[PDB]
Amino acid sequence: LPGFATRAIHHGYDPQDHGGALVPPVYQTATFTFPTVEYGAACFAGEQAGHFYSRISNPTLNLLEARMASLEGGEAGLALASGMGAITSTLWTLLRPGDEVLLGNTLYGCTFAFLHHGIGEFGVKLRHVDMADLQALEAAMTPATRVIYFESPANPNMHMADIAGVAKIARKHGATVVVDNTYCTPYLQRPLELGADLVVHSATKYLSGHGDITAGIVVGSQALVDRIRLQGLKDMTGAVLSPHDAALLMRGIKTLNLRMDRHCANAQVLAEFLARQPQVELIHYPGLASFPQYTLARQQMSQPGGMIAFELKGGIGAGRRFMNALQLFSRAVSLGDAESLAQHPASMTHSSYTPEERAHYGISEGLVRLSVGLEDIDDLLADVQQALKASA
Amino acid sequence: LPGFATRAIHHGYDPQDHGGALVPPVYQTATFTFPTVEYGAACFAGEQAGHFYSRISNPTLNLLEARMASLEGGEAGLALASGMGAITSTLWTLLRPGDEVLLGNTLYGCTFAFLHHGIGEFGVKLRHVDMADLQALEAAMTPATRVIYFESPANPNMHMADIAGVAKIARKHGATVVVDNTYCTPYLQRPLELGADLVVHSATKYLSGHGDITAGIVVGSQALVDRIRLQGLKDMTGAVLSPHDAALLMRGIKTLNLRMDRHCANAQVLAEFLARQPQVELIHYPGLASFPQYTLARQQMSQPGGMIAFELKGGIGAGRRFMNALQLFSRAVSLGDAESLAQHPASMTHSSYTPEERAHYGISEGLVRLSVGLEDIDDLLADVQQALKASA
Amino acid sequence: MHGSNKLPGFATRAIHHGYDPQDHGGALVPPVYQTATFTFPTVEYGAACFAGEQAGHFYSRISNPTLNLLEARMASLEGGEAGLALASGMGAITSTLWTLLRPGDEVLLGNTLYGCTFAFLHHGIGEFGVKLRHVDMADLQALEAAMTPATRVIYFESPANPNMHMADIAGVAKIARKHGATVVVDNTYCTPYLQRPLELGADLVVHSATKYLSGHGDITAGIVVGSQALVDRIRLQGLKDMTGAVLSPHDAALLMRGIKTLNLRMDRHCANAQVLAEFLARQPQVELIHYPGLASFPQYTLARQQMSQPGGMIAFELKGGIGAGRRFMNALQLFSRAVSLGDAESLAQHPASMTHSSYTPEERAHYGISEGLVRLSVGLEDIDDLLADVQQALKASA
Amino acid sequence: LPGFATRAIHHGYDPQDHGGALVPPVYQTATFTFPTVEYGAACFAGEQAGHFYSRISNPTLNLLEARMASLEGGEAGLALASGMGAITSTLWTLLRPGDEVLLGNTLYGCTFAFLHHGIGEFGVKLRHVDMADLQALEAAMTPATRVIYFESPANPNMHMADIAGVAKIARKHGATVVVDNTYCTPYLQRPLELGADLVVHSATKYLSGHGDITAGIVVGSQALVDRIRLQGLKDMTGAVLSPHDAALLMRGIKTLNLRMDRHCANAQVLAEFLARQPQVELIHYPGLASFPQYTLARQQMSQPGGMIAFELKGGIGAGRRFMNALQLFSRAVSLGDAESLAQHPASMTHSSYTPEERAHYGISEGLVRLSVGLEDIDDLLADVQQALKASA
C-alpha cells in the first residue's frame, strides 16, 4: 500500500490512459456523447462505465473523488461546489420528515443556519449533544434518530469528539455518523477508520490550500455516496463543481502533507508563544499540554493542526485593537490558506450581536481565531508581538 | 436604454474601475479581507458595500448577475453552480411545509424528480395543471398556493403558457410566479416583463452557448433574490458558481443575440424540411404555421427558438435507428451548444419501461428532440436526410 | 443528391473539424491538455517521438493535443496542410521569419506594417544581416522590378495596418513562382472567413489570433498556416529554439471557443462597419474616410476581388485638426479609447493625441500618418448605439 | 526584510488595492483602455505608469515579475511563455553580429540548439569553456566577448560554475553574466547576490512545481530587464505568458520552499542508496561527500537539489531495462514536478546518435537522470530497487 503523499499525487491515474499526459486533462465539458442510444440508455439506468452529464459525474471530478476516497480510506468520494454543498447534499438525502438528527454542541455558522433555519423547518427534529460525553449521547438516542453529525475539532473552541465512542453507539442503534473533517484533512484525522460512515469537507480550506476555489467533498461507503450523488447533488442542491476548480483542488492536494506539516509547525510556536503572555486569558490549541482534551486529540489527530483560538483580557476592545493592529495577518474569515488569516467573531462575523446574545452560544467576548499560514514564523511572531502591545 | 447586444457586452462594467482592463479580471478568490474589524462588521450586517466570501457574493459573479438582470429586465440576479442549483435554491427558500405549488404539466426530468422525490417528500404539496388552460389554472388555485412554476416552452413537447394570463391569476390569488426561461433566453422571451416574479435559467445551455460550463441564473426583485442568496444558496444548496465559469458564461453571453439568430434560422429550415418527409408523423416547432399554439408563440417569443421535437412513424425502433445513424448531430442530452445535438428519450433518459409508463408521463414512443446548432444548414439537412432513410 | 466527397461548410468545420467526441470519453468539448510534459510506455516509444517514425507526444513546446486540434482546424479554415499555434501574433511572425531567413537573404516588405513587425524587421532581424526593402505591393510592375536572386521572402499585410492598403495576393504569388520567393501574408484583418491567401497562391499565412479569431479580447495568441514542410520547419526551429513562444493550452482552448462563432461575429462586424462608414461619409465633420466597402476607397475593386466582405476596420480624418480629434475621442462614451481590434467592444484611437502624441505636427508625414486621423475597430454592439455615440462625439468636436 | 516564505506568499500585493481580494484577480485581457487621450499619450512614452497591451506589461504578470525579482534579490522581473522564451529574449537583446558569447561546457539541449543552429547562424561567435576553471575563462575572454552564459549546476553531470569568480573576470572586461538558475531556484541559489547580472528560469520546472504550465522568468537590473521587455519580448520573440499560467505559477511559488525541502531530502536518501549499488558505475549528486565540486557546491547552494544523474555498468542496455521496469517513476523528459521523472538520454533524447557521438557531445552510454519527486521515499526506494534488479 503506497504512502499518503504518493497517493495524493498519483492515485487513480495512469498517464498512459490519456495520450501520456502527466497532468490529467481537464474535462471542461457539460455533456458527453453516446456511441449508441442503447449505450446512452444504460448510463441513465446506471449499469456501465463512462458518462452522460457533468452534474452527475465527470472524469476530472471522478479522479478527484477516487483520490480523496483513497486518502480518507473510504470506498467512494463525491465532489461538490462548496462545503455547504457537501453537507446539504448529504443531509438532504439521509433525512425525511420525522427523522431526528443529533448534532455537536457547536457548529459552523452556516451549518447551524442550515440545520435550524433550513432543513429543521421541514419537519426534521434537532438536538445538540456533547460528543465527548458518551453517557449524554447514549441517553439522547431514540429509534427516530437517523443521523449523528459533528465537527472534530469543532468551530471555534476546538471541542473534540470521541469518534470511535460515538460510532460504536450509532452502530447499535442503526444511526449514520457524518463527520466534518475540514480542520484536520485526511492527513491528520481519518474518521472513517474510527468507524464513521461519512466524512464531509470544505475543500475551500486546507485541501485547496491557496484560497482560490470554493469546493466540497463527501467520502464514505459506495452505497451512501451513490445515494447522495443521485439525490442530494443531482436533484436537491445542484452543487456542481467546475472541472477547472476540481483540477485546481487536485493541484493543492499534491502538497497537502507538506503544507500541513508547516501549518502545524508554525501553529505550535505561536500557540506556545501566546501561552506565555500577560494579555492572554486562555488558549484552545490541541498540542498544548494545558488543552482540556489533550489525550483524546492525540488518539485521533496525528498533529495538532493549524488553528489557534484564544481570548484576551479586555474582551471586545482588546480584540478590535489587536485585529486592527495586524500588519501581516489579514482580517478575514476562512482558514487553511497559505496566507495567515485572523478573525475575531465578537466584532466581525457576529458583530451586530450584543454581548448578551453571544453568551447564549459557545462564543466568547474576547475570542480571536487564528489560521496560521505558511509564512516565515519569525515574521508571524513579530506581527502578533506588536498586535498584543497595541491591544493595551 | 442601449440595445440588447450593447448591454450583453457592456452592462455593469467600466474598464476605468479596474486599471483600464477591457475584459474584467477574474476574481478567482474564495475570501476577501477587511481594512478594519468595524468595516468587516458591516459587511456581515449587510449595511456596507463590499465582499467577504465567494459563496455569498463575488465581484466576477456580481457582474454576471447584474448583466443578466439587465437582459431579463429585472432588478437583481444570482449566479449558481447549475440550473438545478438555480431551481432548488429558489424553491427551498420560497416554500415551507403546507404550501401548495402548481406545476406545469410537463417538466424537465430532474425538476420533476426534485419536486416529487425531493422537496415534495418534506410536506410540500404538488399539483399539475395545464398552464395553457387559464380556466383550469384559476380553478386549481387556493390560498395555500404559494408558487406557480413552469417552463415555457416546456420540455419536451414544446408546450406553451400564456405568461401574462398566468401572472394575472397570480396577482388575484396572491401567488409567486416562477418561469424557467432556458429554452428562449432573455433575447427571445422576458417573463418578468409579462408579470413573472422570478425567472430561472440553466446557463449551461444557450447563455453559455459553448458546452463547457455548468451554471444557473436566477433573476427577479432585489427582495426575492436577496432571500434566495442569503438562504437557498448560502444555507440550503451551496451551489456556488466558479468565477472561472462565471467569466466563461459572460464570454458566451457576448454573442447571445448572434448565436440565437442562427439557431433559430437553422431550426426553421430544418422544421420545414422535417414536416415534408414521409418518415415523420408529427412535428412540434413554434415557427411552423401548423404549431397548435402558433399565435401565442409569435405574441410572446420574438423568434421560434432552436429546439425541434418530432415523432417518427415507426415508433421507438425507428427512433433508435434514426439516432444511431447521425454522423454530424451527436447523441446527447442537453441543448444550446454550437454542436447540433439529438436525443430519443424513449430509448435514452426514459428507457427501461414499456410504452405504458411512457404514455401517462407524456413522452411518445417515437419522439425525438433536436437542439439545432450553428453548423452549415446544408450539412445538417444532409445528416438528417440519411438518418431518416436509415430509420425505416 | 450529392455524396461524402463534398467539403463541409465553414461554420461546420469551425465547430467540428479534427475532433470526434468518441475518441475522448465522449466529451463534447475537447479536454484541455493543461500539461507541460508527456510520458512514454517503453523507453523506445520516447526514442521514435524525437526521431523519425512515431505519431505521439513528448513536450508541449513542440506539440500538445489541444494545440494540435486548434492547428488542424485553423489549417482547414485557411485551406492549408498544417497549422502552428503560438503565444502571440508577434510569436507567429518572428518564429516564421527567424526560420525562413538567414544573413544575406533579402525580404521584400509591404509599404506599411504593424508597428512591432516594422521594429522586428528594422531593429531586430535586420540588424542580424538580413537585408530589407519596401515595395508598394499593389504595383505588380514595381514588385517584379525589385526581385533579386537574394530575395528569399516576400512578406506583407493585406489589408495593411493601419491605412488598409492592399496587395494582389494572386499577382504576388505568380511573381514569386517565377523568381522563387516564399510569400508570407499576415491575414489578421480578414481572417480565413473573409480571405484565404493560401488559396490565392501564398505559401504561408500568419495571424494575430488575439483579434477576430479569439474575438473576445481575453487571450494573446498566434497562428501560422501553410504547407506541412514549412510549418514543421517553423515548429522545429522558430518556436522550439528561437522564440519559445508557446501557447498555453488554456488559451488555445479559448481561441477554439472563439472560432466556433467567427462567421457570425465577422458578419456582424462587417454589417456594423458598412452602416457606420456610410453614415460617417455623409457627415459635415469628416474630410476623407477609408473603408473597403465604399466605392471611394482607393482599391475598391481589389478589395471585392479578394475579400468576401469589407471587414470591421474604418479610418477617417476630421475637420478641426488635432483639437477636434482630441475632443471627439474624449466625447466617446460607448467606444473605448484603446489600440487593438477584433474585440466584441468597439475601439477608437486618435493617433494625433494618443499613439503619436510625443511627436510634433510636421514629423507625422515623414514617419507616416495624418493630423485628425481616427482608426476604428467596429464591435458587435447594437448599431444604433454606435451611431448615437459617434454622432454626439462629432457634435463635441465641432 | 521578511523571510523567503513570507515574500513568496505576499511580496508586491495588498488585498486592499483590489476590493480586499486575498488572492489577486487574474487579468485575462488583451487590451487596456484609457479614460482620456491625454492619459493614453504617456503609455507610449513611460512617464505615466499605467498599462496598454499585455505583451508589454499586464498587472498579473507584473506581480509575478516583482515577486520573482524579490526572491532573487534583483531590481526587476520579466514573465515569458517558456524558459526558451526567457533565454532567447535575453540573448537576442544583448547580442549582435560579431559579438562572442562564452558558454558553459554543457547546456540544455534546446539552448545548445538555439546557440549553434539559431543565433550562431546570424554571425554571433560561440565558445565553450569550463566555468569552474577561472584560468581558462580569463584566457578565453576577448573584446568581442559580450555575454557569459551557463547553467550551474549544469546538464548532465551537475558541473558547477564559480559564479563569483566568473563575475569578477566579467567585471574586468565589462561583460554581462547570464545564469540559468532553473535547477536550484532562488530558494537554493541566488546568482545575483554572487555577482551575476541576469538570471533566467524555465518556470515550467520547480517554480511551477506541478507540471501544468510552460513559463519563463528573467530577473536582473531594471535597465537590462526593460530592454529585454521592449526588445526581446516585444519585437523578437512574442513569447507572451498567459495571465492564467502566470496565476498558476504564482500559486506554485507559494509552496516553493516546502517542495524544494522535500525534493532535496528525497534526493539525499535516494543518492545515498544509489551510490552503494553494484549496478552503479558512477553517480553525480552535489550532496554526496565524494562529489568533485562538493565544496564549491555548498558555497552557492543552500541545499544539494532534487536532481540525480548516475551511470549503469551494463551500458546503454542496462539503462533501457532499468527505465522500462520503473512503475512509479514516469519515463519522461522535464523535471521539477511533484511526480518523479526519469530519462535515460542514451535511448531517449539522443538515440539517433551512435556510441562515439555521445561522448563527443558530453553524454554517457549508461547515463540516467532522475528528477526526484515529492512521493513517499519508501515507495521511490522500492521502485528504483526493483528496477535496478531488472537492469542486470
Ligand SMILES: CSC/C=C(/NCc1c(COP(=O)(O)O)cnc(C)c1O)C(=O)O
Ligand atoms: C460565513 S463565510 C465563513 C466560512 C468559514 N468556513 C467554511 C466551513 C464550511 C463551509 O464550507 P464552504 O461552503 O466551502 O464555505 C464547512 N465546515 C467548516 C468547518 C467550515 O469552516 C469560516 O469562517 O471558517
Ligand SMILES: CSC/C=C(/NCc1c(COP(=O)(O)O)cnc(C)c1O)C(=O)O
Ligand atoms: C438528464 S440530463 C439532461 C438535462 C437537460 N436540461 C437541463 C435543464 C435544467 C437543469 O439545468 P442544469 O442543472 O444546468 O443541468 C433546467 N431547466 C431546463 C429547461 C433544462 O433543460 C436536457 O436534456 O434538456
Ligand SMILES: CSC/C=C(/NCc1c(COP(=O)(O)O)cnc(C)c1O)C(=O)O
Ligand atoms: C501596440 S498594441 C496594438 C496591436 C495591434 N495589433 C497586433 C497585430 C500583430 C501582433 O500580434 P500580437 O502579438 O498578438 O499582438 C501582428 N499583425 C497584425 C496585423 C496586428 O494587428 C493593433 O493596434 O492593431
Ligand SMILES: CSC/C=C(/NCc1c(COP(=O)(O)O)cnc(C)c1O)C(=O)O
Ligand atoms: C526537449 S524537451 C526537454 C526540456 C528540459 N528542460 C527545459 C529547460 C529549459 C527550457 O525551459 P522550457 O522552454 O520551459 O522548456 C531551460 N533551462 C533548463 C535547465 C531546462 O531544463 C529537460 O529535459 O530537462
